């Protein structure tokens, strides 16, 4: 984990996320939306289990991205919860929740759910 | 369960659902959207654990509603997964998934997640 987590990860939609896993569980980095142009970067912050494992389990982690930067404000935030599996073909398998700020009448429809698999390739 | 489940349930949004729990696990009934006018009814079908319990656990159940009837076609379906807790103040606590049919480009945003608590009052 940690050293294995630090780096660039790509998902099946063309998004790129670059993160540094700190010694004590911190996750810091940026998320880049497709196209890959400057203004597609958002800050991400999260945490991971720095002491995961005699039975080959994955490392639990999660991070959040608020979709606001100096070019866009999508008035929403997404959190990814999942685990890191290292090895020849390491991957981070996640499920995410994307919540948009709504008025109280639309609160019932404010959150979408999905899943993403990130690889180093 | 079963006899305790059969009846009318109301949620915190003003929706009403009337169901019959069959001896062998079937759940059949109708869901009515707010206002309460004719055209607000949709068919619901589901299943529940007909043999739940020496430790006061709830009864697991789930049901589905496709949002199409003879007045409306919202091209979506919702499934509610939860458990029935009977007693003085019985309730069905659920989490739901609402998926809309989308083109493949919007598939990533096709499902919303929420929760509902239904009571008999």
């Amino acid at each position: 984990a940690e050293a294995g987590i630090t780096g660039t990860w790509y998902n099946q939609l063309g998004s790129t996320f670059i993160v540094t896993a700190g010694a004590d569980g911190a996750l810091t980095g940026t998320y880049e939306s497709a196209v890959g142009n400057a203004e597609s970067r958002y800050v991400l912050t999260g945490r991971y289990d720095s002491a995961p494992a005699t039975d080959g389990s994955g490392t639990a982690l999660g991070w959040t991205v608020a979709w606001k930067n100096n070019y866009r404000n999508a008035h929403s935030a997404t959190t990814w919860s999942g685990q890191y599996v290292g090895g020849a073909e390491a991957r981070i398998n996640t499920q995410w929740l994307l919540t948009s700020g709504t008025t109280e009448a639309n609160a019932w429809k404010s959150t979408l759910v999905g899943h993403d698999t990130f690889t180093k390739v | 369960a079963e006899a305790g489940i059969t009846g009318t349930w109301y949620n915190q949004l003003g929706s009403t659902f009337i169901v019959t729990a069959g001896a062998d696990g079937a759940l059949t009934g109708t869901y009515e959207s707010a206002v309460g006018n004719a055209e607000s009814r949709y068919v619901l079908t589901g299943r529940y654990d007909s043999a739940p319990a020496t430790d006061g656990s709830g009864t697991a159940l789930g049901w589905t509603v496709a949002w199409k009837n003879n007045y409306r076609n919202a091209h979506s379906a919702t499934t509610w997964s939860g458990q029935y807790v009977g007693g003085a103040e019985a309730r069905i606590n659920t989490q739901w998934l609402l998926t809309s049919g989308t083109t493949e480009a919007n598939a990533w945003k096709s499902t919303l997640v929420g929760h509902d608590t239904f009571t008999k009052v």
């Binding site: 063309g14 939306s33 497709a34 196209v35 597609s40 991205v65 979709w67 994307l98 | 990533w108 945003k109």
Partner: peptide, 8 residues
């Protein structure tokens, strides 16, 4: 939305 695929 910035979390989506390319729109292309």
């Amino acid at each position: 939305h910035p979390q989506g695929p390319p729109c292309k």
